[PDB]
């Protein structure tokens, strides 16, 4: 009750608008590759293990 508020009888209406801040797109997709399978399956590496 310590905030300013609008009072409405039966003939009154209320409205406001709002803008969202920049936010990343929700990712609505599934990956067709897995993280451990990003290599070319034909070719050898030049690194050694």
């Amino acid at each position: 009750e310590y905030f300013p508020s609008q009072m409405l009888r039966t003939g009154n209406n209320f409205q406001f608008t709002y803008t969202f801040e920049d936010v990343p797109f929700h990712s609505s997709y599934a990956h067709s590759q897995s993280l451990d399978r990003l290599m070319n399956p034909l070719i050898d590496q030049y690194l050694y293990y």
Partner: protein
């Protein structure tokens, strides 16, 4: 001469023979046997005493 007429270098560009159909990393050692011919002109102006 401190700055003599510059030396002129010429080479035939290597043309490989047919590579294998499976990839191999080593440099190709098979080429088409090849040579070239042509004409060359040189003109010099000489000062006389």
């Amino acid at each position: 001469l401190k700055h003599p007429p510059p030396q002129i270098l010429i080479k035939n560009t290597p043309v490989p023979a047919d590579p294998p159909t499976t990839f191999n990393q080593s440099k190709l050692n098979s080429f088409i046997t090849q040579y070239s011919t042509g004409q060359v002109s040189v003109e010099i102006e000489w000062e006389l005493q």
